[PDB]
Design a protein around this ligand. Sequence first.
Ligand SMILES: CC(=O)N[C@@H]1[C@@H](O[C@@H]2O[C@@H](C)[C@@H](O)[C@@H](O)[C@@H]2O)[C@H](O[C@@H]2O[C@H](CO)[C@H](O)[C@H](O)[C@H]2O)[C@@H](CO)O[C@@H]1O
Ligand SMILES: CC(=O)N[C@@H]1[C@@H](O[C@@H]2O[C@@H](C)[C@@H](O)[C@@H](O)[C@@H]2O)[C@H](O[C@@H]2O[C@H](CO)[C@H](O)[C@H](O)[C@H]2O)[C@@H](CO)O[C@@H]1O
Lengths: 306, 307
Amino acid sequence: KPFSVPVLTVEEMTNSRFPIPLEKLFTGPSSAFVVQPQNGRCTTDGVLLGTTQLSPVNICTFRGDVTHITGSRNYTMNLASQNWNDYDPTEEIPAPLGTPDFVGKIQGVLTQTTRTDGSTRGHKATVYTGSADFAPKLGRVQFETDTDRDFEANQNTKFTPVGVIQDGGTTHRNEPQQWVLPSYSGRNTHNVHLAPAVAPTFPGEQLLFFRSTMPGCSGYPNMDLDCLLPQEWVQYFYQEAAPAQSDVALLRFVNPDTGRVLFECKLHKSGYVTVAHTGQHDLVIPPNGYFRFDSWVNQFYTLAPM
Amino acid sequence: SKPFSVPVLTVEEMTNSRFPIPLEKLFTGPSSAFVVQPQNGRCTTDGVLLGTTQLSPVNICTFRGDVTHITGSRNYTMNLASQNWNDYDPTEEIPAPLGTPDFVGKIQGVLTQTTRTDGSTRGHKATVYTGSADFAPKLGRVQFETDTDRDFEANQNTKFTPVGVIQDGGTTHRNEPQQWVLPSYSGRNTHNVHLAPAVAPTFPGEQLLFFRSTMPGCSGYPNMDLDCLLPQEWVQYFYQEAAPAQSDVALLRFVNPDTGRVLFECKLHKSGYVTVAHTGQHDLVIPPNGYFRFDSWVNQFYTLAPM
Ligand SMILES: CC(=O)N[C@@H]1[C@@H](O[C@@H]2O[C@@H](C)[C@@H](O)[C@@H](O)[C@@H]2O)[C@H](O[C@@H]2O[C@H](CO)[C@H](O)[C@H](O)[C@H]2O)[C@@H](CO)O[C@@H]1O
Ligand SMILES: CC(=O)N[C@@H]1[C@@H](O[C@@H]2O[C@@H](C)[C@@H](O)[C@@H](O)[C@@H]2O)[C@H](O[C@@H]2O[C@H](CO)[C@H](O)[C@H](O)[C@H]2O)[C@@H](CO)O[C@@H]1O
């Protein structure tokens, strides 16, 4: 079975790290920090990595039951799986699938249904993923809410993410920090089973990022969110499971109107993209442009500069 | 001719095409008593999108645009933009903007906004009543009820993220939303246009097979059932594959890969919906790894074995 990538434009696709559309392509240097996202991680031959799962709507969602931290508006969620089955902390993954993979304050809504009569309720909620009590790998996360009384115990509860916040009395855009992983088991613990950090290895190359802008809900947040693979590429590679014939797939970004190649890039087998560029650059692309797999190449292939 | 197929995905791995939430189960029931004409999750087997259907699972029931405050209230009117912030064209031959809600109800979510000059941001609880006289997305305007009369700015990018549905608990429980009642997309006293057709089983002993989710509820006692005709992933897959239909009916088998055995067969109609041989309302009991597989194109006389 021949390898390929989807015929989808950037704007037709979805971020693999938050449930929002892609907007644009960005490249920049990343040697000064660690790029190790856990969502949007998949090999070209269809092996899921990190905390990656298949639907974009489940990314940064939580489900479980909640208990009230009395004397506060905070609730502890005992996590369940997406289908309400028991969450198993012994599974060899860093955290439940779809767990946020950055340190920040994610605002959304906590909803709940009472099983017996079908009464429902929803409240503004924020999860601080840098919190000592953010421990999704252990099965527990804390939400700050706008109620101290309305949520019931032992009832199905869901967090739907909306956006991110920042404290405007402090330096603008200082949070979130999209490249800082949470400590998934809480303070003084070490992460396990992580998808590896990524970096270009070839001289003159940089990572190519698939970029969105997260909604902001308060203050002056850094809303940039870069994934290594569109969620649709994760979905497609998982479906196709085409064997990799080398460690590097050469892709051309093509303008279907002219048939002209705008740029070429390397799709690495372990699931990220590099380009030949030095410096920060927002790519200018025609909106109907798309990626096309042309050939498997060896470890010595030099990309045309873009 | 490119061979037809459906994705190897379990039900729980897939997504509702009518609200941005996972599928939970398969359901069949009679539908002769009401009109089944959803506009999201509509696609032919050879990949032609229909109704208000588009490819993004996360854009379903989202709105983007700019907002104007309705003086003397906590309500805002959104002037709609396209999903990529381009101008919305009301003359396009579609029922409404792609992804527009396709049922009458009160959808609660959050309106968020960024001020372009300094990156200041804001978010507020918001509800859109899709049965409202001023729900007119086809014309490019929708009204949102919020918890502020002052915080949103004009001429700034504003997004509605859907969360769930509400109901008025002082009235008969589960009386809303009404998932099979289409909104009036151009507002009060208007007629919808360019609709994907209503669907019904035609064959004796057959019913629609529905891909079912439960919408989150945010207040009251809502009817949270939400049935789509196709998983969003099947829309995405047919769009990509564009495999020609060789007849009007694709026979599918629902298979348990753990055992290699067929649990039931069903018909995937070319115009994009599924029927099974069953009478009455029934939640299907399926193994967790079960999935659909294409068997062959059949003629108009093929009879399904009872489900
Ligand atoms: C949801 C809420 O009420 N949040 C407020 C903050 O206001 C939000 O963020 C500011 C920057 C602005 O975008 C508002 O539209 C949002 O509602 C508030 O931040 C201060 O708000 C004032 C204006 O009201 C100034 O713009 C300051 O620069 C902001 O720091 C903070 C602090 O008062 O309180 C809540 O978080
Ligand atoms: C968000 C909010 O406060 N909504 C309330 C309604 O309460 C919600 O809905 C009820 C059914 C329940 O699930 C609450 O936990 C929700 O917060 C409220 O409905 C009444 O709620 C009371 C209990 O507080 C009784 O259950 C009544 O039977 C419900 O009608 C309505 C009416 O008071 O007000 C807000 O919409």
